[PDB]
Amino acid sequence: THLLPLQPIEIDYTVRVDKASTYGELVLDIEVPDVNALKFNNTQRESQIGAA
Amino acid sequence: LKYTKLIAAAEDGSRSTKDMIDAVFHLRYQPDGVVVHRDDPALVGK
Amino acid sequence: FLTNELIRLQMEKLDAKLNHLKKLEKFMELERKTLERQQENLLIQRLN
């Protein structure tokens, strides 16, 4: 029950009225899954190669 | 084995943080999954 | 004469298994790679 599905990222951001451009201030980096690597990895596992 | 010296140096107390990570790493790493830059000196250059 | 025939047959028999040893030698390379991978994980978790 304790295990839960992926929770979202929370940020607090303030609109700037006098500060015309607020472009480069808030930049945040996240990691996304690479499905190709996951597929190449789960089909090449020590168990499967050992069985082969 | 390949990391038998990097592993030993990790827990003997020497190379506490930066020395070790730079020794391992071509690949890119960030210090966490989510990294937020509330304000950055170089990024405001855009 | 018969003793020499026996010895030849036995050596021929040994040669086949001495050849079969090499594949079992390759599984050792598999195990070595897996151990190095586990070491990767341990290193990175210690740094974490």
Coordinates of N, CA and C in Angstrom, one line a residue, chain C residues 3-48:
Chain C
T3 N 47.9 -53.7 -26.6 CA 48.1 -52.6 -25.6 C 48.2 -51.2 -26.3
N4 N 49.0 -51.2 -27.4 CA 49.1 -49.9 -28.1 C 47.8 -49.5 -28.7
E5 N 47.0 -50.4 -29.2 CA 45.6 -50.0 -29.6 C 44.8 -49.4 -28.5
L6 N 44.8 -50.0 -27.3 CA 44.1 -49.5 -26.2 C 44.5 -48.1 -25.9
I7 N 45.8 -47.8 -25.8 CA 46.4 -46.5 -25.5 C 45.9 -45.5 -26.5
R8 N 45.9 -45.8 -27.7 CA 45.4 -44.8 -28.7 C 44.0 -44.5 -28.5
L9 N 43.2 -45.5 -28.3 CA 41.7 -45.3 -28.1 C 41.5 -44.4 -26.9
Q10 N 42.2 -44.6 -25.8 CA 42.0 -43.8 -24.6 C 42.5 -42.3 -24.8
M11 N 43.6 -42.1 -25.5 CA 44.0 -40.8 -25.8 C 43.0 -40.0 -26.7
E12 N 42.5 -40.7 -27.7 CA 41.4 -40.2 -28.5 C 40.2 -39.8 -27.7
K13 N 39.9 -40.6 -26.7 CA 38.8 -40.3 -25.8 C 39.0 -39.0 -25.0
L14 N 40.3 -38.9 -24.5 CA 40.6 -37.7 -23.6 C 40.6 -36.4 -24.4
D15 N 41.0 -36.5 -25.7 CA 41.0 -35.3 -26.5 C 39.7 -34.5 -26.6
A16 N 38.6 -35.3 -26.8 CA 37.3 -34.7 -26.9 C 36.9 -33.9 -25.7
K17 N 37.1 -34.4 -24.5 CA 36.7 -33.7 -23.3 C 37.7 -32.5 -23.1
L18 N 39.0 -32.7 -23.4 CA 39.9 -31.6 -23.3 C 39.5 -30.4 -24.2
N19 N 38.9 -30.8 -25.3 CA 38.3 -29.7 -26.2 C 37.1 -29.1 -25.6
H20 N 36.2 -30.0 -25.0 CA 35.0 -29.5 -24.4 C 35.2 -28.5 -23.2
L21 N 36.4 -28.5 -22.7 CA 36.6 -27.6 -21.5 C 36.5 -26.1 -21.9
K22 N 36.6 -25.7 -23.2 CA 36.8 -24.3 -23.5 C 35.5 -23.5 -23.3
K23 N 34.3 -24.1 -23.6 CA 33.1 -23.5 -23.4 C 32.8 -23.2 -22.0
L24 N 33.1 -24.1 -21.1 CA 33.0 -23.9 -19.7 C 34.0 -22.9 -19.2
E25 N 35.1 -22.7 -20.0 CA 36.0 -21.6 -19.7 C 35.4 -20.2 -20.1
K26 N 34.4 -20.2 -21.1 CA 33.8 -18.9 -21.5 C 32.8 -18.5 -20.5
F27 N 32.0 -19.4 -19.9 CA 31.1 -19.0 -18.9 C 31.7 -18.2 -17.8
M28 N 33.0 -18.5 -17.5 CA 33.8 -17.7 -16.5 C 33.9 -16.3 -16.9
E29 N 34.0 -16.0 -18.2 CA 34.1 -14.6 -18.6 C 32.7 -13.9 -18.4
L30 N 31.6 -14.7 -18.6 CA 30.3 -14.1 -18.3 C 30.3 -13.7 -16.8
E31 N 30.7 -14.6 -15.9 CA 30.6 -14.3 -14.5 C 31.4 -13.1 -14.1
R32 N 32.6 -13.0 -14.7 CA 33.5 -11.9 -14.5 C 32.8 -10.6 -14.8
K33 N 32.2 -10.5 -16.0 CA 31.5 -9.3 -16.4 C 30.4 -8.9 -15.3
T34 N 29.6 -9.9 -14.9 CA 28.5 -9.7 -14.0 C 29.1 -9.1 -12.7
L35 N 30.2 -9.7 -12.2 CA 30.8 -9.2 -11.0 C 31.2 -7.7 -11.1
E36 N 31.8 -7.3 -12.3 CA 32.2 -5.9 -12.4 C 31.0 -5.0 -12.5
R37 N 29.9 -5.5 -13.0 CA 28.6 -4.7 -13.0 C 28.1 -4.4 -11.6
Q38 N 28.1 -5.5 -10.8 CA 27.7 -5.3 -9.4 C 28.6 -4.4 -8.7
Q39 N 29.9 -4.4 -9.0 CA 30.8 -3.4 -8.4 C 30.5 -2.0 -8.8
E40 N 30.1 -1.7 -10.1 CA 29.6 -0.4 -10.5 C 28.5 0.0 -9.6
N41 N 27.5 -0.8 -9.3 CA 26.4 -0.4 -8.5 C 26.8 -0.1 -7.1
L42 N 27.7 -0.9 -6.5 CA 28.1 -0.6 -5.1 C 28.9 0.7 -5.0
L43 N 29.8 1.0 -6.0 CA 30.5 2.2 -6.0 C 29.5 3.4 -6.0
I44 N 28.6 3.4 -6.9 CA 27.7 4.6 -7.1 C 26.8 4.7 -5.9
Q45 N 26.4 3.6 -5.3 CA 25.5 3.8 -4.1 C 26.3 4.3 -2.9
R46 N 27.6 3.9 -2.8 CA 28.4 4.5 -1.7 C 28.6 6.0 -1.9
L47 N 28.9 6.4 -3.1 CA 29.0 7.9 -3.4 C 27.6 8.6 -3.1
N48 N 26.5 7.9 -3.4 CA 25.2 8.5 -3.0 C 25.0 8.6 -1.5

